[PDB]
Design a protein around this ligand. Structure first.
Ligand SMILES: O[C@@H]1[C@@H](O)[C@H](O[C@@H]2CO[C@@H](O[C@@H]3CO[C@@H](O[C@@H]4CO[C@@H](O)[C@H](O)[C@H]4O)[C@H](O)[C@H]3O)[C@H](O)[C@H]2O)OC[C@H]1O
Ligand SMILES: [Ca+2]
Ligand code: NA
Ligand code: NA
Length: 488
């Protein structure tokens, strides 16, 4: 009954994090037991004849957000319509001054006893903006109505590409913004311009995280290119960035790789240490921009980065379209960082999923091959999505659902369907033990939602769980908002 194949994130593998769409320039928020990943909205551009053309970043006007409690099952929180200029996101789009929202950065700060969230983004190469929210997934407000940082921000002149923000809230509650990149000398930098672009910047933020304090300092990242990052390990601040591709490079600053520098203060002085992530081309073939954030989630150090692993699998060429990956990052006893072993296997699931809570359908580890959108389902979480583009033989799967010793009694699915179909609930594999079959009736339409219940038996212990979609003809069989098992 399950016939569709995984594009790039194969069952058992944790990279790329998702493959049912793209997501470039990832950054991580760790918050109340979940990692959020916020991403540039990579999205295929097409020639007029419907063939794919190389990514020119034309579609980078949203921020894609996924989250996980376990590194394997990703809840799709959909898209934040950040860019509102030109104009389009069809209306919708939150920062009216910004035509683009590249390379997000995310921070949370408790203000007046309430957690407040701050999403930073680059309006292409021209400035940094910020949105605010009372939850990591929104809804979002543009407090300011203009960029937060421009070339006129003190200290920011001399930056070639005023982009790739990284916002770090220090242990004392002070925010810092790292930004910049590009290489001076336009079409022909001299060797020395390659070697010391002097286009990286850090600026301190005001307490409210929507203003700057003082002037930006230059970080002299050798062979700076883009992709500022900041993490703090054992009291030391690590400024990381992508090394440029031009000029001759010494062996210790290899082109297109992630370099890093350390300092005992967030604003420097920084000393190059420092490379830990080869170009994604070195691992997955070969190659492109390289774009990364280091974070600690549930007591482990990771780097999120991107690679052209979904587009290459679909097209035979990555064409600049990028997908998020995570691997472990290891700090040595001396504080240096080991080369990250970027791969497909990725990170092993760190905790089980509880299938007795409401679980969004768009919370899955693997799929073949569906889409997620914006749902009309009543209620649900902020920016509630559903699984759609469900055809016969499609499926989604969660990793390590723990049904417990007693096991499940029933399975509920919130579904909307014009003609109906089935959800087969299978353990371990797409062709695995059938524990139940939910008959999706005609509900009256794709926006008319019914919670359907069906019996489950044989579902005990920890398993991958596959929801295999079947139906006749069509089209879209149904959309698929959330599910919940009952005990026992
Ligand atoms: O409008 C401005 C944009 O144009 C500017 O876009 C940047 C263009 O450069 C992007 O970096 C690319 C990454 O790929 C490099 O080539 C690789 C060299 O090794 C080969 O193995 C591999 O196949 C190649 O892909 C290329 O040299 C380098 O320029 C950068 O990420 C973009 O940001 O952005 C700012 C806008 O203001
Ligand atoms: Ca949902
Ligand atoms: Na970033
Ligand atoms: Na499909």
């Amino acid at each position: 009954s399950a016939t569709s194949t995984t594009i790039a994130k194969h069952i058992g593998n944790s990279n790329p994090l998702i493959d049912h769409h793209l997501g470039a320039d990832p950054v991580a928020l760790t918050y109340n037991g979940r990692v959020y990943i916020y991403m540039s909205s990579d999205d295929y551009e097409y020639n007029s004849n419907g063939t794919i053309k190389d990514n020119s970043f034309a579609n980078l006007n949203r921020v894609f957000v996924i989250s996980s409690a376990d590194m394997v099952n990703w809840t799709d929180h959909g898209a934040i319509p950040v860019a509102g200029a030109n104009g389009a996101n069809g209306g919708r789009g939150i920062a009216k001054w910004a035509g683009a929202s590249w390379a997000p950065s995310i921070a949370v700060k408790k203000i007046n006893g309430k957690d407040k969230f701050f999403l930073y983004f680059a309006n292409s190469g021209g400035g940094i903006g910020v949105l605010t929210a009372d939850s990591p997934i929104g809804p979002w407000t543009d407090p300011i109505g203009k960029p937060l940082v421009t070339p006129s921000t003190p200290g920011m002149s001399g930056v070639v590409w005023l982009f790739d923000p990284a916002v770090f809230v220090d242990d004392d509650g002070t925010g810092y913004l790292y930004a910049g990149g590009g290489v001076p000398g336009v079409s022909n930098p001299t060797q020395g311009q390659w070697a010391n672009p002097k286009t990286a910047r850090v600026i301190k933020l005001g307490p409210d995280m929507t203003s700057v304090v003082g002037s930006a300092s230059t970080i002299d990242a050798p062979f700076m290119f883009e992709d500022s990052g900041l993490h703090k390990y054992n009291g030391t601040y690590y400024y990381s960035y992508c090394i440029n591709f031009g000029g001759t490079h010494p062996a210790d600053k290899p082109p297109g790789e992630i370099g890093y520098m350390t300092s005992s203060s967030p604003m420097g002085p920084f000393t190059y240490r420092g490379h830990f992530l080869k170009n994604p081309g070195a691992f997955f073939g070969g190659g492109g921009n390289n774009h990364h954030a280091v974070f600690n989630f549930k007591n482990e150090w990771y780097v999120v980065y991107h690679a052209q692993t979904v587009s290459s699998a679909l097209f035979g060429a990555g064409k600049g379209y990028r997908s998020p990956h995570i691997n472990k990052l290891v700090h040595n006893a001396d504080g240096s960082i080991q080369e990250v072993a970027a791969n497909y296997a990725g990170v092993t699931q760190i905790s089980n999923l509880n299938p007795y809570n409401r679980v969004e359908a768009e919370t899955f580890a693997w799929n073949g091959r569906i889409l997620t959108e914006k749902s009309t389902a009543p209620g649900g979480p902020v920016n509630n999505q559903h699984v759609t583009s469900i055809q016969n033989g499609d499926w989604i799967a969660v990793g390590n659902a723990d049904f417990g010793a007693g096991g499940a009694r029933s399975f509920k699915a919130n579904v909307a369907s014009t003609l109906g179909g089935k959800i087969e609930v299978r353990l371990d594999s797409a062709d695995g033990k059938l524990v139940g079959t939910l008959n999706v009736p005609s509900t009256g339409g794709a926006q008319t939602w019914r919670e359907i219940e069906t019996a489950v038996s044989g579902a005990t212990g920890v398993h991958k769980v596959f929801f295999v979609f079947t139906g006749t003809g069509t089209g879209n069989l149904f959309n698929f908002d959330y599910w919940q098992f009952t005990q026992r």
